[PDB]
Structure formats: C-alpha cells, structure tokens
Design a protein around this ligand. Structure first.
Ligand SMILES: OC[C@H]1O[C@H](O[C@H]2[C@H](O)[C@@H](O)[C@@H](O[C@H]3[C@H](O)[C@@H](O)[C@@H](O)O[C@@H]3CO)O[C@@H]2CO[C@H]2O[C@H](CO)[C@@H](O[C@H]3O[C@H](CO)[C@@H](O[C@H]4O[C@H](CO)[C@@H](O)[C@H](O)[C@H]4O)[C@H](O)[C@H]3O)[C@H](O)[C@H]2O)[C@H](O)[C@@H](O)[C@@H]1O
Ligand SMILES: [Ca+2]
Length: 862
C-alpha cells in the first residue's frame, strides 16, 4: 500500500505528525486532478482521549479539524491525500470508518419466513451488487444491485434465494493499484462455500437437513467438565490423524469423516487416551484456509514407497516433497481466508452441505468418546490482501481496514503476513461473531488463540463473556464450560502495548484465559527453539550428561541446571506470580521474582487455569526429536525413551493445564523438522500401527532446516537412534498410566492459587540441592480438626519424584518421614520393570527412585 502517514481518526479530526494543511479528494482516483479541496484548520483542543486510547502510537500527532460542511460519507469513497505546504501523503481511514459507520446489525444472510436479506459492510465502496449462480460451478444467472445506508449495503429477496451461490461485485478504491476496481468478493460472514471459496453458498445454517442425528441433544451427551482445572489437551492435525490409517476407507482418509470411524486404529487410540482421562482435543486450523485445494482430484503427492527406498540421511526425500508441496494435500492451515466455514479439503464433497454436516459429525463423534473439541483459531493475520485472487476477501472489500498498517501505511507482517487489526471495531466484531458461530452452530468446546499477543485484550475479554454466557435453553450449549487459551507472545508492533493493551502473557494474568508456558518448555528441553540446537536443559542432560558439542564450565552447568530446576518447579506449581519457592541460592522468591534469561518473570499467572504447561507442540522439534538432538549421541534409544516419558510426565503431573503434542505418547518424529507446516504427509506421518515413529526418513526440508543438516544427518543415519515397535508401545503404555495417575487424585488438579500455596511444597531445594531431582508434595486434610478442605477421599498426601539422573537416587525428607506412603497402585502394576522398584521407608522418610524415572507415592486413607 502507498505512503499514508496521516490518519482520519474521527468524523471531524485528522491526525498528522507535522510541525497550512489541506485535504484533496478524487472519486475517479485521478490525482492536480481532485474533485474536492478542503482546508483543515489546526484543532487547538488536540486529539481526544478516546482517540489516544484507541491509537496510542499516534498520541503525539497534531490534530486538524475537518469542517462540518464536508460530506464525509462521500469523501471516504474517494482517493484521498492531505498536503502540508510541500509534503503529500495518503490517509489511513479506520478511525473515521469506525466513528461514522460502526455497525452492529446483521451481516451476511438473514432468513425470515418469506425472505432472505444480505448485508455487507463496505463503507468506502462506490457500488455493490450481488451476482447469483445456480450451482457451485455454473454461470452467473442474475445480478442484483444493493442499496447503501451508513456504509452498509443491503438487499432483501424472496425465500427462493436460499441455496443459491453468490459473490459480491464491489466497486472500490484500492490504494495498491491507485484505481477504483470492480472486485468479485466472497462474504466475510459466509457459512459455506463452493470449492476453494470461489463462491459463497447462501445456506441457512439452522436448516434441519444439515444436522446429524441427535445433534440438538449433543449438550446432554457432552463429557462432564466440573472445573477448568480438570482439563488436559491433546494437539492434533486433522489430516495427520488418518492420512496413513489403513483401517480407514481410502475415500475418508485425511478429513472430518475419519473421526466417525469408531473402530479405526486412530479412533481406538483416541479412545484409549480419553478413557485414561484426556479431556480435550485441540484440532489444528479447520476453517477456510488457503494452501490446499478443496478438490481432492487436484492433489499431487509423492509415492511413499519410492521415498522409503532412499537413505535415512539423504536430502532426496525433502527435494521430492518440496517439488510438489504447493500442490499436495497438506498444510497446517495458518493461512486464513474465511474464518466461519469448515475447510473444504477435509470434507467428502467441497460443494454443498457435506462440509457442515461432517464437521458436526466430527464434534459429535469426539464428544461421544469422552473428548471435548478445541478449535485452533487464527484471527491475527490473513493469507492474502489486495484486490486480486480468490484467497483475498476482507481486504478486497474494505482495503486497508481489516489489516494493521505501520505509520507509513504499509501492511504489518510480523504474524507471518497481513496482520489483522482487532483494535478496529468491525474486526473485533467479526472475531467474536465467528467464535459464537463455532460455539453455537458447531457446539465447539474451546478455542486456542494463535498469536494471542496480536489480538486486543478487550477482544479476548468480550469473547470470553459472550461465549461463557451461552446457555443450553437459548443456544443449545452450556457456555460456562467453554475454555479459552492462547499463545500470548509479545513482540514486534504490538509489544509494550503500542497498539493498545494486547493479549500478551503478562496482560492476560488474572483473566482466566490460559497461555502457553514457554518457561517450563525451555527449562526442561534446554535453550530455546531459536537458539543453539545443542544447548542442554534439565531433561536433556545439562551438567549430568554433557553432549560434548556445546557447554559452559561445570560449576556453570551445575548452577545452570539448578536455575532450570527452579523455573520448572514454579511451572509445576501452576506458574503463579505469587507462589513462594526456596530458590537454588537459598533465598525464598515469588514466581514472578525468578527470571528467565531474557529477564522475564518466570511465574506470571493468577491461577493454574491460566497456565498451559507444555514441552512440545506442532511448532518446532517434536519431543522425541529434541531429545535425540540434545542428549549425548552415545545414549541408547532405550534411555532416550525414558527421557521422553519423563518430559510428558512432568506435564501430566503439573498443576495447571497439561498440553500434549499428538505423538508425545508414541515417540513421534518428523526427522528433526523444526517447522513442518508444508512438509507433507511424509515428514508429518502419524503411524497408528506403531511399527514406526518416522525417525530416519531423510533430512527435513531445506527452507527451514538446511543450517542444521550437519547435526541431523549423522543422527538420522545412526540405526541406534531409531526405536522399534516395542519402544513405541511401551511409551504409549506408560503415557496412559501417568494420565490415569493425574485423574486418580484431585490433588494434582488444584483449582486455585490459594490451594496451591497451601498444599504444594518442593523438597529438594536450595544451594545444596541434589542435581537432577525434583520432589513435589501435595497435602490434603488429615487427622481430626483438619486445617483445609478434604479434596481426596482416597489419599491424604501425594509425593512425586522426578529423577533425571542416570542412576538411582534416595531422597530423605524429614517432613515426610513416619507416614503411610506407598507406590501408586498404577505404578505398582506398571509394565515398566524399573518404576516398580521405587520405594518409601518411613523411618527416614526416604524415597528411592531408579535412574531416569518418575515415581508417584500416595498415602492411603484408612
Ligand atoms: O510466524 C512465522 C513463524 O511461525 C513459527 O514460529 C512459531 C514458533 O515456532 C513458536 O515457538 C512460537 O514462537 C515464540 C516462542 O515459542 C517464544 O518462546 C518466544 O520466543 O516468542 C516466539 C514468537 O515470537 O510461535 C511462533 C508463531 O507460531 C504461530 O503463528 C504462525 C502464524 O500463524 C504459525 O506459523 C505457521 O504458519 C505460517 C503461515 O502458513 C508459516 O509461515 C510461512 O509462510 C509465510 C507466508 O505467509 C512466510 O511469511 C513464512 O516465512 C513462512 O514460514 C509458518 O512457517 C508455520 O509454522 C505457527 O504454526 C503458529 O503456532 C515458525 O516456527 C517459524 O518458522 C515462522 O517463521
Ligand atoms: Ca502443501
């Protein structure tokens, strides 16, 4: 977009950072060449507080008054410049468009008894018509003019318009082309589409033929959720789930329908996890995104049997995958086009109703096996901008409004590309309207907000209120149980609240909305995903087992290990700002007083429900891969498997909300791909036969990985690094056991900061702490005249020992001596021979824990 350094902030005020200012307008975009010239006098009252609160980054700008004689509604449809006498620049219009034309009425389609209405917000447009098609691929049948009122274009037609397909013909000034262009655009409020969103389907989302059997009774069948503190999350990509599952019919692999195959290997796997206690599945982007063709017959994919013949450390597999990666069935989907419609490529038929019905059937099916469904929502950026292409919708209709721009008028791209501006009224409105669409129309149980730091906190909080007030009687869903969390990363143009108070980790403290705890992730794994890949952490051999490629000294690494242990313990106690820990110096510190290496407070939340504890996710290296990179090369795969289990167990037995990447439980590899978003089914394989974990399938794609190929190649080629079926199955068995343990006692899932401060203590702390061991005790009411509520009818105390040392340790804890501790019944019965050797001795309060083991001890009541 061109140079635009001035802002039209309200109907009567323009803001521009100058030290004789005039406004020029041309309806034909001919600019000399203007239709209208207007002198702007300096406004001695300056910018109102409402303006500076909305746009903090321009609070220093001088104010200029637009005379009340000006027809603002007409001028915003023109090419506009302001001039200072000579400096000429364009005008950024969102302020005035909101001030004059903010609209809360119906958008998209409204169905009444005898009519269908369409409304489009397009306040800068010179004309809007609707072009109707009979059929998803047929020719235009008729064009109907819409009428404008206050920036909204509308038309009401007969009920027979239902199930037509349509597009809007929008005549609008596009700054990138310096022309008024006739753009063919989909409906921002679309609820279904033809293939690839080429046209919008004029569907009544409430139509009974779009509901699976018993859909209206789904609320009655949903899994009970007593508390947000009972949540565990499993993060899964829809295509990954079934792309390689031979127990699913070829036709139904990779999409929504595979979730309706009860006895498939995949659904049996999810059943196993759900029955162990898993509560929520977080599905990667499942709305209309670009980068995958909805027409399956257009897909190109490599012969996997061919690629299997190539050497494990070769660059040939990735070259083959990359050659057709833009035309294959595969993308994570963080490329938003239209938020309110299910992705067509995941439907059996991308035209008509199947994408709606099959999405609903997926939610129903997951609910019926005991899993609530979370959507990964991506409101922070758009795939495309500008007037051209099927994949640009929002910016095609109202250019320069839905996207955030810098102070020169250029689109901000920190999110990926085409950052949105949730600070603008109709963007905020669309986001919340979309969330309510998914909650009511699809009965979705929660939302993970991609780049939540790019979203205004006021949008997050309004979304929370709107969702959690939905009721079964009025909306068919219990909104009180809908859970929100997100990745509250604070960077680029939204950092330091520059565009308003944003959804950063620190800003979302005390909101009851969760955020990913990167502190526990980095302390466990070591380093960070964008630092040195060989930097070790608490669970990857720092100090105890140096890898010999990296390091510092060993008083360095001993203290570095202890520093990481402190960070982990704060996270294990819900990552609270006010939780007090005896730190490794011996000084007692609040969680917020302990800092990361970038000076960030480690603990920042006001509640465990605000913490999403993780070591792995779709981004960056899988758990198995990060362990395989960072640990000494000489470790056996058997040892690394125990290390995998330790990491996932630290999550599963933490206070807060545990988050697992799909495949944590089965040693999933991507052959060390750090960003597999476009790396195809080959690198992203999820193998529910358990025969392979996808280690050693070639060097991963060069685009994101080539700099690290030298460390990857020898490991990928080393047969000693590759697990067998037995290892994979053992990992799954111990994973399920640890989930069962979490759900065996309410003590692991405390619901408030007060409860955690009262009940949770760590017993291996201070300057003489034993390296590589964390001991965590959780107390319940005991004796007559109890001190606290009794939460657990079975156990009066639980102790977890995490031992990352390669050798057995004995921890003597006097505070826990002379008690009735025994190994947890689940671990007494474990298929793992080692954990069964764990023991407690009352005389000394001694907990004996084998090397590379997590041992859970319980004090039974009576
Ligand atoms: O945003 C681009 C960036 O995305 C990924 O980066 C992740 C990162 O891996 C993850 O760890 C975290 O980073 C934070 C870190 O964890 C914190 O400790 C702290 O240090 O702050 C960090 C953030 O500053 O989050 C990052 C963002 O991830 C999330 O957002 C992404 C955008 O929605 C999404 O990225 C995926 O999708 C995009 C779009 O398809 C894709 O981008 C490709 O295409 C773009 C053209 O549109 C082009 O500009 C990019 O250059 C190209 O890569 C990403 O590759 C793909 O991962 C995340 O999935 C979502 O969770 C990623 O790892 C980086 O490689 C990438 O540069
Ligand atoms: Ca692809």
């Amino acid at each position: 977009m061109p140079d635009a350094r001035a802002y039209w902030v309200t109907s009567d005020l323009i803001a521009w950072n100058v030290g004789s200012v005039c406004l020029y307008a041309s309806r034909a975009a001919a600019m000399q060449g203007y239709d209208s010239k207007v002198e702007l006098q300096p406004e001695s009252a300056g910018l109102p507080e409402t303006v500076t609160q909305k746009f903090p980054f321009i609070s220093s700008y001088r104010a200029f008054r637009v005379p009340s004689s000006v027809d603002v509604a007409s001028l915003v449809k023109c090419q506009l410049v302001v001039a200072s006498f000579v400096d000429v620049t364009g005008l950024q219009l969102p302020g005035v468009l909101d001030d004059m034309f903010a609209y809360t009425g119906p958008l998209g389609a409204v169905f009444s008894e005898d009519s269908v209405s369409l409304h489009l917000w397009a306040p800068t447009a010179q004309g809007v018509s609707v072009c109707f098609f009979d059929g998803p691929a047929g020719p235009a049948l008729e064009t109907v003019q819409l009428k404008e009122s206050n920036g909204v274009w509308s038309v009401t037609g007969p009920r027979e318009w239902e199930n037509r397909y349509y597009l809007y013909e929008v005549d609008v000034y596009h700054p990138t082309k310096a022309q008024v262009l006739k753009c063919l655009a989909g409906d921002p409020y679309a609820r279904s589409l033809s293939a690839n969103g080429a046209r919008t389907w004029l569907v009544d989302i409430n139509n009974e033929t779009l509901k699976p059997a018993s859909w209206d009774e789904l609320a009655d069948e949903k899994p009970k959720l007593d508390s947000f503190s009972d949540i565990t999350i499993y993060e899964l990509h829809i295509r990954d789930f079934s792309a390689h599952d031979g127990t699913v019919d070829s036709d139904s692999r990779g999409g929504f329908r595979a979730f309706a195959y009860q006895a498939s290997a995949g659904m049996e796997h999810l059943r196993k996890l759900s029955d162990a206690g898993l509560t929520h599945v977080h599905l990667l982007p499942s709305f209309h995104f670009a980068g995958v063709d909805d027409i399956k017959s257009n897909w190109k994919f490599v012969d996997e049997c061919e690629l299997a013949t190539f050497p494990p450390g070769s660059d040939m597999q990735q070259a083959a995958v990359v050659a057709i990666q833009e035309e294959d069935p595969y993308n994570w989907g963080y490329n938003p086009v239209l938020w309110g419609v299910p992705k067509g490529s995941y439907a059996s038929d991308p035209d008509g109703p199947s994408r709606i019905i099959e999405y609903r059937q997926m939610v129903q099916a997951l609910n019926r096996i005991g899993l609530r469904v979370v959507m990964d929502v991506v409101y922070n950026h758009l795939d495309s901008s500008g007037p051209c292409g099927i994949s640009s919708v929002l910016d095609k209709i109202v250019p320069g409004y839905y996207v955030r721009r810098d102070t020169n008028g250029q689109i901000e791209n920190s999110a990926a590309m085409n950052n949105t501006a949730s600070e603008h009224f109709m963007v905020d409105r669309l986001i919340v309207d979309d969330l309510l669409n998914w909650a009511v129309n699809y009965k979705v149980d929660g939302f993970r907000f991609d780049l939540m730091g790019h979203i205004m906190k006021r949008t997050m909080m309004r979304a929370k209120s709107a969702l959690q007030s939905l009721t079964t009687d009025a909306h068919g869903v219990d909104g009180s149980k809908i859970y929100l969390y997100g990745a509250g990363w604070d960077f680029a143009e939204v950092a330091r609240n520059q565009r308003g108070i944003n959804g950063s980790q620190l800003n979302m403290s005390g909101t009851g909305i969760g955020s990913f705890n990167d502190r526990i992730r980095d302390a466990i794994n070591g380093g960070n995903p964008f630092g040195n890949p060989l930097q070790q952490g608490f669970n990857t051999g720092l100090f105890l087992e140096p890898n010999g490629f990296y390091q510092g000294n060993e008083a360095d690494t001993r203290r570095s290990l202890a520093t990481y242990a402190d960070q982990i313990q704060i996270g294990l106690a819900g990552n609270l700002r006010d939780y007090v820990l005896i730190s490794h110096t011996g000084e007692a510190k609040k969680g917020s007083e302990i800092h990361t290496f970038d000076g960030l407070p480690v603990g920042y939340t006001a509640s465990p429900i605000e913490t999403i504890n993780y070591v792995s996710a779709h981004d960056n290296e899988t758990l198995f891969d990060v362990i395989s990179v960072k640990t000494p090369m000489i470790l056996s795969v058997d040892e690394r498997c125990r290390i995998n289990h330790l990491a996932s167990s630290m999550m599963a037995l933490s206070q807060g909300i545990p988050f697992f990447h799909a495949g944590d439980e089965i040693l999933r590899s991507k052959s060390i791909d750090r960003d597999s978003y476009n790396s195809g089914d080959w690198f992203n394989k999820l193998d529910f036969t358990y025969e392979t974990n996808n280690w050693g399938v070639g060097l991963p794609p060069s685009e994101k990985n080539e700099d690290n190929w030298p460390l990857m190649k020898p490991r990928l080629e080393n047969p000693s690094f590759k697990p067998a079926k037995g290892h994979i199955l053992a990992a799954l068995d111990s994973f399920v056991d640890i989930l069962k343990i979490r759900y065996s006692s309410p003590l692991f899932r405390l619901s408030t900061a007060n409860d955690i401060k009262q009940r949770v203590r760590f017993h291996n702390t201070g300057p003489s702490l034993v390296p590589g061991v964390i001991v965590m005790g959780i107390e319940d009411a005991r004796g007559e005249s109890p001190e606290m509520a009794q939460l657990d009818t079975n156990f009066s105390y639980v102790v977890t020992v995490f031992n990352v040392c390669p050798h057995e340790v004995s921890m003597d804890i006097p505070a826990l001596a002379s008690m009735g501790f025994e190994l947890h019944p689940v671990q007494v019965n474990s298929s793992d021979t080692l954990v069964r050797k764990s023991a407690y001795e009352a005389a000394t309060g001694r907990f004996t824990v084998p090397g590379r083991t997590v041992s859970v001890f319980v004090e039974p009541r009576c």
